mmCIF file of all heavy atoms in Angstrom:
data_model
loop_
_atom_site.group_PDB
_atom_site.id
_atom_site.type_symbol
_atom_site.label_atom_id
_atom_site.label_comp_id
_atom_site.label_asym_id
_atom_site.label_seq_id
_atom_site.Cartn_x
_atom_site.Cartn_y
_atom_site.Cartn_z
ATOM 1 N N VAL A 1 -13.231 10.295 1.877
ATOM 2 C CA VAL A 1 -13.425 11.751 2.300
ATOM 3 C C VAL A 1 -12.616 12.714 1.541
ATOM 4 O O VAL A 1 -11.808 13.477 2.147
ATOM 5 C CB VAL A 1 -13.277 11.922 3.812
ATOM 6 C CG1 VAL A 1 -14.134 13.001 4.335
ATOM 7 C CG2 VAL A 1 -13.513 10.649 4.599
ATOM 8 N N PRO A 2 -12.687 12.768 0.117
ATOM 9 C CA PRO A 2 -11.974 13.867 -0.542
ATOM 10 C C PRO A 2 -13.023 14.937 -0.884
ATOM 11 O O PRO A 2 -13.732 14.855 -1.907
ATOM 12 C CB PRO A 2 -11.393 13.267 -1.765
ATOM 13 C CG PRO A 2 -11.829 11.786 -1.762
ATOM 14 C CD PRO A 2 -12.966 11.704 -0.775
ATOM 15 N N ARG A 3 -13.275 15.929 -0.028
ATOM 16 C CA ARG A 3 -14.243 16.995 -0.179
ATOM 17 C C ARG A 3 -13.618 18.252 -0.841
ATOM 18 O O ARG A 3 -14.320 19.208 -1.020
ATOM 19 C CB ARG A 3 -14.987 17.297 1.102
ATOM 20 C CG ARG A 3 -16.058 16.334 1.465
ATOM 21 C CD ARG A 3 -16.765 16.595 2.736
ATOM 22 N NE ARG A 3 -17.839 15.694 2.976
ATOM 23 C CZ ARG A 3 -18.656 15.617 4.074
ATOM 24 N NH1 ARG A 3 -18.442 16.497 5.021
ATOM 25 N NH2 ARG A 3 -19.584 14.738 4.185
ATOM 26 N N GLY A 4 -12.314 18.107 -1.218
ATOM 27 C CA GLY A 4 -11.706 19.040 -2.111
ATOM 28 C C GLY A 4 -12.131 18.655 -3.527
ATOM 29 O O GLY A 4 -13.204 19.005 -4.025
ATOM 30 N N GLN A 5 -11.337 17.739 -4.174
ATOM 31 C CA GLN A 5 -11.737 17.047 -5.408
ATOM 32 C C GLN A 5 -11.453 15.580 -5.268
ATOM 33 O O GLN A 5 -10.438 15.224 -4.636
ATOM 34 C CB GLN A 5 -10.934 17.622 -6.618
ATOM 35 C CG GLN A 5 -10.892 19.134 -6.724
ATOM 36 C CD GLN A 5 -12.270 19.791 -7.006
ATOM 37 O OE1 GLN A 5 -12.988 19.420 -7.896
ATOM 38 N NE2 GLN A 5 -12.596 20.806 -6.144
ATOM 39 N N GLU A 6 -12.299 14.742 -5.902
ATOM 40 C CA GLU A 6 -12.253 13.326 -5.770
ATOM 41 C C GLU A 6 -11.677 12.593 -6.992
ATOM 42 O O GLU A 6 -12.331 12.400 -7.933
ATOM 43 C CB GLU A 6 -13.639 12.712 -5.331
ATOM 44 C CG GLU A 6 -13.632 11.295 -4.977
ATOM 45 C CD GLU A 6 -14.960 10.882 -4.416
ATOM 46 O OE1 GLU A 6 -15.378 11.412 -3.362
ATOM 47 O OE2 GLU A 6 -15.645 9.945 -4.948
ATOM 48 N N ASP A 7 -10.483 12.040 -6.739
ATOM 49 C CA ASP A 7 -9.818 11.056 -7.692
ATOM 50 C C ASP A 7 -9.386 9.798 -6.862
ATOM 51 O O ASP A 7 -8.877 8.836 -7.451
ATOM 52 C CB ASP A 7 -8.591 11.743 -8.343
ATOM 53 C CG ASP A 7 -8.908 13.043 -8.998
ATOM 54 O OD1 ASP A 7 -9.966 13.175 -9.719
ATOM 55 O OD2 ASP A 7 -8.176 14.008 -8.781
ATOM 56 N N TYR A 8 -9.541 9.875 -5.575
ATOM 57 C CA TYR A 8 -9.088 8.879 -4.613
ATOM 58 C C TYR A 8 -9.904 7.571 -4.563
ATOM 59 O O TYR A 8 -9.363 6.580 -4.086
ATOM 60 C CB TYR A 8 -9.086 9.527 -3.164
ATOM 61 C CG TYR A 8 -8.687 8.653 -2.063
ATOM 62 C CD1 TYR A 8 -7.379 8.155 -1.964
ATOM 63 C CD2 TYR A 8 -9.605 8.190 -1.090
ATOM 64 C CE1 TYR A 8 -7.053 7.303 -0.890
ATOM 65 C CE2 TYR A 8 -9.223 7.442 0.012
ATOM 66 C CZ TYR A 8 -7.962 6.950 0.026
ATOM 67 O OH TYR A 8 -7.582 6.128 1.106
ATOM 68 N N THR A 9 -11.115 7.595 -5.131
ATOM 69 C CA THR A 9 -11.957 6.385 -5.229
ATOM 70 C C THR A 9 -11.251 5.259 -6.131
ATOM 71 O O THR A 9 -11.353 4.043 -5.860
ATOM 72 C CB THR A 9 -13.334 6.633 -5.812
ATOM 73 O OG1 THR A 9 -13.787 7.915 -5.282
ATOM 74 C CG2 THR A 9 -14.295 5.559 -5.462
ATOM 75 N N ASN A 10 -10.507 5.701 -7.157
ATOM 76 C CA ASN A 10 -9.656 4.871 -8.002
ATOM 77 C C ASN A 10 -8.491 4.405 -7.268
ATOM 78 O O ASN A 10 -7.991 3.209 -7.457
ATOM 79 C CB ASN A 10 -9.277 5.548 -9.248
ATOM 80 C CG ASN A 10 -8.540 4.752 -10.228
ATOM 81 O OD1 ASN A 10 -9.240 3.795 -10.834
ATOM 82 N ND2 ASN A 10 -7.311 4.995 -10.544
ATOM 83 N N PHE A 11 -7.939 5.157 -6.331
ATOM 84 C CA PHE A 11 -6.725 4.880 -5.546
ATOM 85 C C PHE A 11 -6.987 3.812 -4.442
ATOM 86 O O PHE A 11 -6.014 3.038 -4.026
ATOM 87 C CB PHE A 11 -6.126 6.069 -4.898
ATOM 88 C CG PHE A 11 -4.723 6.019 -4.516
ATOM 89 C CD1 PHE A 11 -3.677 6.358 -5.485
ATOM 90 C CD2 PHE A 11 -4.257 5.614 -3.238
ATOM 91 C CE1 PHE A 11 -2.299 6.313 -5.145
ATOM 92 C CE2 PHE A 11 -2.918 5.480 -2.967
ATOM 93 C CZ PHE A 11 -1.939 5.829 -3.841
ATOM 94 N N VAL A 12 -8.223 3.648 -3.979
ATOM 95 C CA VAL A 12 -8.642 2.597 -3.053
ATOM 96 C C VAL A 12 -8.378 1.243 -3.511
ATOM 97 O O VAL A 12 -7.714 0.353 -2.836
ATOM 98 C CB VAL A 12 -10.214 2.808 -2.573
ATOM 99 C CG1 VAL A 12 -10.570 1.741 -1.681
ATOM 100 C CG2 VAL A 12 -10.384 4.164 -1.981
ATOM 101 N N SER A 13 -8.789 0.980 -4.827
ATOM 102 C CA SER A 13 -8.447 -0.248 -5.483
ATOM 103 C C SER A 13 -7.032 -0.435 -5.885
ATOM 104 O O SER A 13 -6.488 -1.639 -6.006
ATOM 105 C CB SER A 13 -9.314 -0.403 -6.809
ATOM 106 O OG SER A 13 -9.100 0.623 -7.642
ATOM 107 N N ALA A 14 -6.305 0.659 -6.045
ATOM 108 C CA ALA A 14 -4.842 0.648 -6.476
ATOM 109 C C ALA A 14 -3.984 -0.004 -5.430
ATOM 110 O O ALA A 14 -2.995 -0.682 -5.797
ATOM 111 C CB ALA A 14 -4.379 2.048 -6.811
ATOM 112 N N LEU A 15 -4.226 0.287 -4.154
ATOM 113 C CA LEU A 15 -3.555 -0.347 -3.035
ATOM 114 C C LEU A 15 -3.865 -1.894 -2.859
ATOM 115 O O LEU A 15 -3.081 -2.714 -2.504
ATOM 116 C CB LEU A 15 -3.807 0.409 -1.706
ATOM 117 C CG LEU A 15 -3.213 1.780 -1.569
ATOM 118 C CD1 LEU A 15 -3.905 2.585 -0.532
ATOM 119 C CD2 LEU A 15 -1.660 1.793 -1.221
ATOM 120 N N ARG A 16 -5.129 -2.162 -3.204
ATOM 121 C CA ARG A 16 -5.657 -3.562 -3.171
ATOM 122 C C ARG A 16 -5.105 -4.404 -4.308
ATOM 123 O O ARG A 16 -5.009 -5.646 -4.142
ATOM 124 C CB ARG A 16 -7.232 -3.562 -3.273
ATOM 125 C CG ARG A 16 -7.888 -3.220 -1.903
ATOM 126 C CD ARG A 16 -9.370 -3.472 -1.992
ATOM 127 N NE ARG A 16 -10.049 -3.389 -0.641
ATOM 128 C CZ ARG A 16 -11.277 -3.652 -0.433
ATOM 129 N NH1 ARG A 16 -12.090 -4.117 -1.354
ATOM 130 N NH2 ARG A 16 -11.823 -3.416 0.816
ATOM 131 N N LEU A 17 -4.789 -3.724 -5.398
ATOM 132 C CA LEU A 17 -4.151 -4.485 -6.583
ATOM 133 C C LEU A 17 -2.708 -4.893 -6.305
ATOM 134 O O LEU A 17 -2.262 -5.841 -6.855
ATOM 135 C CB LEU A 17 -4.175 -3.586 -7.858
ATOM 136 C CG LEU A 17 -5.527 -3.476 -8.647
ATOM 137 C CD1 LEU A 17 -5.595 -2.128 -9.379
ATOM 138 C CD2 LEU A 17 -5.692 -4.621 -9.567
ATOM 139 N N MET A 18 -1.990 -4.119 -5.439
ATOM 140 C CA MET A 18 -0.616 -4.472 -4.958
ATOM 141 C C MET A 18 -0.585 -5.693 -4.112
ATOM 142 O O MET A 18 0.468 -6.362 -4.060
ATOM 143 C CB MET A 18 -0.011 -3.299 -4.238
ATOM 144 C CG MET A 18 0.453 -2.195 -5.105
ATOM 145 S SD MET A 18 1.572 -1.028 -4.251
ATOM 146 C CE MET A 18 3.111 -1.939 -4.364
ATOM 147 N N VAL A 19 -1.710 -5.988 -3.436
ATOM 148 C CA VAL A 19 -1.838 -7.244 -2.601
ATOM 149 C C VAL A 19 -1.995 -8.503 -3.472
ATOM 150 O O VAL A 19 -1.427 -9.524 -3.224
ATOM 151 C CB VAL A 19 -2.956 -7.120 -1.577
ATOM 152 C CG1 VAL A 19 -2.721 -8.047 -0.413
ATOM 153 C CG2 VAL A 19 -3.205 -5.693 -1.045
ATOM 154 N N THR A 20 -2.811 -8.262 -4.546
ATOM 155 C CA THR A 20 -3.296 -9.381 -5.334
ATOM 156 C C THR A 20 -2.252 -9.829 -6.412
ATOM 157 O O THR A 20 -2.022 -11.031 -6.625
ATOM 158 C CB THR A 20 -4.613 -9.078 -6.010
ATOM 159 O OG1 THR A 20 -5.494 -8.372 -5.115
ATOM 160 C CG2 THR A 20 -5.368 -10.408 -6.484
ATOM 161 N N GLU A 21 -1.608 -8.787 -7.076
ATOM 162 C CA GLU A 21 -0.654 -9.043 -8.170
ATOM 163 C C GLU A 21 0.655 -9.645 -7.630
ATOM 164 O O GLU A 21 1.050 -10.750 -8.088
ATOM 165 C CB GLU A 21 -0.409 -7.799 -9.005
ATOM 166 C CG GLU A 21 -1.513 -7.345 -9.939
ATOM 167 C CD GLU A 21 -1.155 -6.177 -10.793
ATOM 168 O OE1 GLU A 21 -0.165 -6.262 -11.587
ATOM 169 O OE2 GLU A 21 -1.842 -5.135 -10.686
ATOM 170 N N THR A 22 1.380 -8.893 -6.867
ATOM 171 C CA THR A 22 2.632 -9.435 -6.233
ATOM 172 C C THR A 22 2.269 -9.753 -4.783
ATOM 173 O O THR A 22 1.964 -8.864 -3.897
ATOM 174 C CB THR A 22 3.737 -8.405 -6.336
ATOM 175 O OG1 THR A 22 3.714 -7.763 -7.541
ATOM 176 C CG2 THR A 22 5.099 -9.032 -6.202
ATOM 177 N N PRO A 23 2.384 -11.066 -4.376
ATOM 178 C CA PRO A 23 2.174 -11.480 -2.988
ATOM 179 C C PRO A 23 3.370 -11.855 -2.201
ATOM 180 O O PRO A 23 3.277 -11.855 -0.903
ATOM 181 C CB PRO A 23 1.185 -12.623 -3.149
ATOM 182 C CG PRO A 23 1.515 -13.180 -4.515
ATOM 183 C CD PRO A 23 2.349 -12.249 -5.288
ATOM 184 N N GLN A 24 4.403 -12.406 -2.796
ATOM 185 C CA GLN A 24 5.645 -13.014 -2.129
ATOM 186 C C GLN A 24 6.118 -12.380 -0.916
ATOM 187 O O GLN A 24 5.899 -12.726 0.235
ATOM 188 C CB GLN A 24 6.647 -13.346 -3.171
ATOM 189 C CG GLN A 24 7.679 -14.410 -2.753
ATOM 190 C CD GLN A 24 8.899 -14.458 -3.646
ATOM 191 O OE1 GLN A 24 8.874 -14.396 -4.851
ATOM 192 N NE2 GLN A 24 10.112 -14.601 -2.966
ATOM 193 N N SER A 25 7.046 -11.367 -1.148
ATOM 194 C CA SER A 25 7.616 -10.595 -0.054
ATOM 195 C C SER A 25 6.786 -9.402 0.277
ATOM 196 O O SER A 25 7.112 -8.670 1.352
ATOM 197 C CB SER A 25 9.033 -10.159 -0.474
ATOM 198 O OG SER A 25 9.729 -9.489 0.627
ATOM 199 N N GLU A 26 5.728 -9.178 -0.376
ATOM 200 C CA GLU A 26 4.833 -7.931 -0.163
ATOM 201 C C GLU A 26 3.991 -8.171 1.150
ATOM 202 O O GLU A 26 2.907 -8.599 1.099
ATOM 203 C CB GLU A 26 3.962 -7.736 -1.354
ATOM 204 C CG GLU A 26 4.618 -7.504 -2.651
ATOM 205 C CD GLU A 26 4.880 -5.991 -3.057
ATOM 206 O OE1 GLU A 26 4.805 -5.172 -2.168
ATOM 207 O OE2 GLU A 26 5.018 -5.685 -4.266
ATOM 208 N N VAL A 27 4.658 -7.763 2.227
ATOM 209 C CA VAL A 27 3.980 -7.864 3.610
ATOM 210 C C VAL A 27 3.721 -6.430 4.057
ATOM 211 O O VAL A 27 4.583 -5.512 4.158
ATOM 212 C CB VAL A 27 4.871 -8.618 4.566
ATOM 213 C CG1 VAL A 27 4.022 -8.936 5.907
ATOM 214 C CG2 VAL A 27 5.376 -9.938 4.030
ATOM 215 N N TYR A 28 2.474 -6.165 4.483
ATOM 216 C CA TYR A 28 1.958 -4.891 4.920
ATOM 217 C C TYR A 28 2.170 -4.755 6.493
ATOM 218 O O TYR A 28 1.211 -4.619 7.245
ATOM 219 C CB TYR A 28 0.550 -4.639 4.584
ATOM 220 C CG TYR A 28 0.225 -4.461 3.076
ATOM 221 C CD1 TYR A 28 0.397 -5.531 2.206
ATOM 222 C CD2 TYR A 28 -0.027 -3.206 2.544
ATOM 223 C CE1 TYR A 28 0.126 -5.358 0.793
ATOM 224 C CE2 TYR A 28 -0.304 -3.041 1.211
ATOM 225 C CZ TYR A 28 -0.201 -4.202 0.318
ATOM 226 O OH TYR A 28 -0.364 -3.987 -1.006
ATOM 227 N N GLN A 29 3.463 -4.795 6.916
ATOM 228 C CA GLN A 29 3.903 -4.810 8.336
ATOM 229 C C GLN A 29 3.330 -3.783 9.207
ATOM 230 O O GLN A 29 3.462 -2.624 8.810
ATOM 231 C CB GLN A 29 5.376 -5.061 8.405
ATOM 232 C CG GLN A 29 5.964 -6.376 7.873
ATOM 233 C CD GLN A 29 7.453 -6.299 7.622
ATOM 234 O OE1 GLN A 29 8.038 -5.221 7.286
ATOM 235 N NE2 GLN A 29 8.156 -7.479 7.758
ATOM 236 N N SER A 30 2.933 -4.123 10.338
ATOM 237 C CA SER A 30 2.411 -3.151 11.354
ATOM 238 C C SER A 30 3.254 -3.135 12.561
ATOM 239 O O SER A 30 2.805 -3.520 13.716
ATOM 240 C CB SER A 30 0.910 -3.420 11.669
ATOM 241 O OG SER A 30 0.446 -2.409 12.514
ATOM 242 N N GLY A 31 4.529 -2.817 12.387
ATOM 243 C CA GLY A 31 5.481 -2.711 13.517
ATOM 244 C C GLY A 31 5.181 -1.484 14.327
ATOM 245 O O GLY A 31 4.526 -1.606 15.421
ATOM 246 N N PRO A 32 5.646 -0.245 13.959
ATOM 247 C CA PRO A 32 5.114 0.968 14.454
ATOM 248 C C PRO A 32 3.640 1.247 13.914
ATOM 249 O O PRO A 32 3.190 0.567 13.038
ATOM 250 C CB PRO A 32 6.036 2.008 13.801
ATOM 251 C CG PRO A 32 6.706 1.398 12.759
ATOM 252 C CD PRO A 32 6.893 -0.053 13.178
ATOM 253 N N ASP A 33 2.934 2.090 14.604
ATOM 254 C CA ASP A 33 1.553 2.403 14.342
ATOM 255 C C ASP A 33 1.197 2.917 12.920
ATOM 256 O O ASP A 33 0.075 2.749 12.425
ATOM 257 C CB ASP A 33 0.881 3.348 15.326
ATOM 258 C CG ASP A 33 0.484 2.599 16.628
ATOM 259 O OD1 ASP A 33 -0.453 1.749 16.529
ATOM 260 O OD2 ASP A 33 1.070 2.893 17.657
ATOM 261 N N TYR A 34 2.236 3.485 12.261
ATOM 262 C CA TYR A 34 2.145 3.801 10.827
ATOM 263 C C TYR A 34 2.267 2.496 10.024
ATOM 264 O O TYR A 34 3.217 1.731 10.207
ATOM 265 C CB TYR A 34 3.245 4.809 10.389
ATOM 266 C CG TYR A 34 3.264 6.104 11.087
ATOM 267 C CD1 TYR A 34 4.588 6.762 11.409
ATOM 268 C CD2 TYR A 34 2.117 6.815 11.580
ATOM 269 C CE1 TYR A 34 4.631 7.958 12.021
ATOM 270 C CE2 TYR A 34 2.151 8.001 12.289
ATOM 271 C CZ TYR A 34 3.410 8.599 12.438
ATOM 272 O OH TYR A 34 3.491 9.840 13.122
ATOM 273 N N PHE A 35 1.343 2.382 9.045
ATOM 274 C CA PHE A 35 1.376 1.288 8.103
ATOM 275 C C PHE A 35 2.463 1.492 7.092
ATOM 276 O O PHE A 35 2.649 2.628 6.686
ATOM 277 C CB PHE A 35 -0.035 1.031 7.449
ATOM 278 C CG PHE A 35 -0.990 0.441 8.418
ATOM 279 C CD1 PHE A 35 -1.824 1.210 9.139
ATOM 280 C CD2 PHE A 35 -1.147 -0.923 8.505
ATOM 281 C CE1 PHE A 35 -2.770 0.696 10.002
ATOM 282 C CE2 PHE A 35 -2.105 -1.544 9.375
ATOM 283 C CZ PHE A 35 -2.934 -0.692 10.122
ATOM 284 N N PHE A 36 3.122 0.342 6.644
ATOM 285 C CA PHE A 36 4.148 0.417 5.601
ATOM 286 C C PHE A 36 4.243 -0.843 4.902
ATOM 287 O O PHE A 36 4.054 -1.967 5.451
ATOM 288 C CB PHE A 36 5.514 0.852 6.170
ATOM 289 C CG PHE A 36 5.973 -0.054 7.391
ATOM 290 C CD1 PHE A 36 6.881 -1.103 7.074
ATOM 291 C CD2 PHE A 36 5.552 0.151 8.670
ATOM 292 C CE1 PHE A 36 7.346 -1.983 8.123
ATOM 293 C CE2 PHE A 36 5.989 -0.582 9.717
ATOM 294 C CZ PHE A 36 6.879 -1.736 9.459
ATOM 295 N N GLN A 37 4.570 -0.760 3.544
ATOM 296 C CA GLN A 37 4.628 -1.914 2.630
ATOM 297 C C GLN A 37 6.053 -2.229 2.124
ATOM 298 O O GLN A 37 6.723 -1.214 1.659
ATOM 299 C CB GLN A 37 3.646 -1.725 1.512
ATOM 300 C CG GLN A 37 3.432 -3.011 0.640
ATOM 301 C CD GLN A 37 2.756 -2.727 -0.654
ATOM 302 O OE1 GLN A 37 2.345 -1.614 -0.992
ATOM 303 N NE2 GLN A 37 2.570 -3.815 -1.484
ATOM 304 N N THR A 38 6.515 -3.430 2.238
ATOM 305 C CA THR A 38 7.782 -3.886 1.622
ATOM 306 C C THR A 38 7.561 -4.553 0.264
ATOM 307 O O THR A 38 6.548 -5.246 0.149
ATOM 308 C CB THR A 38 8.609 -4.810 2.633
ATOM 309 O OG1 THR A 38 9.742 -5.279 1.877
ATOM 310 C CG2 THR A 38 7.807 -5.918 3.112
ATOM 311 N N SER A 39 8.410 -4.225 -0.647
ATOM 312 C CA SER A 39 8.321 -4.703 -2.048
ATOM 313 C C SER A 39 9.226 -5.826 -2.320
ATOM 314 O O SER A 39 8.907 -6.865 -3.001
ATOM 315 C CB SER A 39 8.528 -3.621 -3.006
ATOM 316 O OG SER A 39 8.224 -4.057 -4.351
ATOM 317 N N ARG A 40 10.552 -5.787 -1.832
ATOM 318 C CA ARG A 40 11.577 -6.776 -2.114
ATOM 319 C C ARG A 40 11.947 -7.651 -0.917
ATOM 320 O O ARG A 40 11.593 -7.295 0.261
ATOM 321 C CB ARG A 40 12.807 -6.045 -2.553
ATOM 322 C CG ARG A 40 12.561 -4.798 -3.399
ATOM 323 C CD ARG A 40 12.393 -5.060 -4.887
ATOM 324 N NE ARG A 40 12.218 -3.776 -5.611
ATOM 325 C CZ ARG A 40 11.898 -3.665 -6.910
ATOM 326 N NH1 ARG A 40 11.721 -4.757 -7.680
ATOM 327 N NH2 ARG A 40 11.833 -2.450 -7.473
ATOM 328 N N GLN A 41 12.563 -8.796 -1.081
ATOM 329 C CA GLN A 41 12.969 -9.713 0.006
ATOM 330 C C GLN A 41 13.849 -9.063 1.036
ATOM 331 O O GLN A 41 13.791 -9.235 2.221
ATOM 332 C CB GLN A 41 13.554 -10.984 -0.487
ATOM 333 C CG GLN A 41 13.331 -12.018 0.541
ATOM 334 C CD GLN A 41 14.216 -13.286 0.300
ATOM 335 O OE1 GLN A 41 15.420 -13.192 0.253
ATOM 336 N NE2 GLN A 41 13.610 -14.390 0.098
ATOM 337 N N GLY A 42 14.816 -8.180 0.537
ATOM 338 C CA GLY A 42 15.635 -7.275 1.331
ATOM 339 C C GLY A 42 14.844 -5.993 0.990
ATOM 340 O O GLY A 42 14.542 -5.784 -0.206
ATOM 341 N N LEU A 43 14.475 -5.175 1.953
ATOM 342 C CA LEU A 43 13.445 -4.048 1.835
ATOM 343 C C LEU A 43 13.887 -2.696 1.527
ATOM 344 O O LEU A 43 13.597 -1.718 2.258
ATOM 345 C CB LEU A 43 12.651 -4.065 2.996
ATOM 346 C CG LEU A 43 13.019 -5.212 4.112
ATOM 347 C CD1 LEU A 43 12.627 -4.813 5.543
ATOM 348 C CD2 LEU A 43 12.264 -6.462 3.678
ATOM 349 N N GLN A 44 14.603 -2.520 0.333
ATOM 350 C CA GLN A 44 15.052 -1.302 -0.096
ATOM 351 C C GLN A 44 14.056 -0.324 -0.706
ATOM 352 O O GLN A 44 14.360 0.600 -1.533
ATOM 353 C CB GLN A 44 16.251 -1.501 -1.142
ATOM 354 C CG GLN A 44 16.227 -2.864 -1.893
ATOM 355 C CD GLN A 44 16.966 -2.835 -3.243
ATOM 356 O OE1 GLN A 44 16.672 -2.040 -4.126
ATOM 357 N NE2 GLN A 44 17.753 -3.876 -3.430
ATOM 358 N N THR A 45 12.721 -0.373 -0.448
ATOM 359 C CA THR A 45 11.837 0.719 -0.656
ATOM 360 C C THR A 45 10.585 0.603 0.190
ATOM 361 O O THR A 45 9.497 0.431 -0.238
ATOM 362 C CB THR A 45 11.464 1.135 -2.120
ATOM 363 O OG1 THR A 45 11.371 -0.107 -2.793
ATOM 364 C CG2 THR A 45 12.481 1.968 -2.822
ATOM 365 N N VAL A 46 10.796 0.646 1.522
ATOM 366 C CA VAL A 46 9.688 0.419 2.399
ATOM 367 C C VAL A 46 9.208 1.636 3.193
ATOM 368 O O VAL A 46 9.542 1.917 4.297
ATOM 369 C CB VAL A 46 10.079 -0.704 3.529
ATOM 370 C CG1 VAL A 46 9.005 -1.216 4.252
ATOM 371 C CG2 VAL A 46 10.858 -1.833 2.733
ATOM 372 N N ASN A 47 8.419 2.435 2.429
ATOM 373 C CA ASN A 47 7.939 3.750 2.912
ATOM 374 C C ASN A 47 6.575 3.625 3.604
ATOM 375 O O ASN A 47 5.841 2.613 3.489
ATOM 376 C CB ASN A 47 7.754 4.665 1.731
ATOM 377 C CG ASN A 47 6.585 4.330 0.840
ATOM 378 O OD1 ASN A 47 5.898 3.323 1.069
ATOM 379 N ND2 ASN A 47 6.347 5.062 -0.197
#
C-alpha cells in the first residue's frame, strides 16, 4: 500500500533475505506486540 510512490515492493523481499542469508541468532521475536529482529547472539542492535 504505497499510494504516494512505490519502491516498497523491493523492500518486501529485502526483509525475507535477512531470514534466509543469516539464520543463527536471527530470531524475529514477538515479545511485545511490535515486531523486532535481533542480529547478534548478545543483541546490541535489536530495533
Side-chain angles (χ1 to χ4, degrees):
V1 211
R3 281 179 178 177
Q5 314 295 307
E6 189 171 298
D7 309 313
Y8 176 68
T9 322
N10 190 64
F11 203 89
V12 178
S13 60
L15 291 157
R16 281 191 175 185
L17 282 155
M18 282 197 82
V19 204
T20 323
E21 284 186 62
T22 320
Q24 198 195 316
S25 183
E26 302 263 23
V27 191
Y28 292 72
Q29 292 163 331
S30 185
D33 278 297
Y34 302 147
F35 286 91
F36 57 94
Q37 193 193 358
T38 172
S39 188
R40 330 274 183 182
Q41 203 194 61
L43 356 155
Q44 27 155 311
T45 32
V46 193
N47 70 0

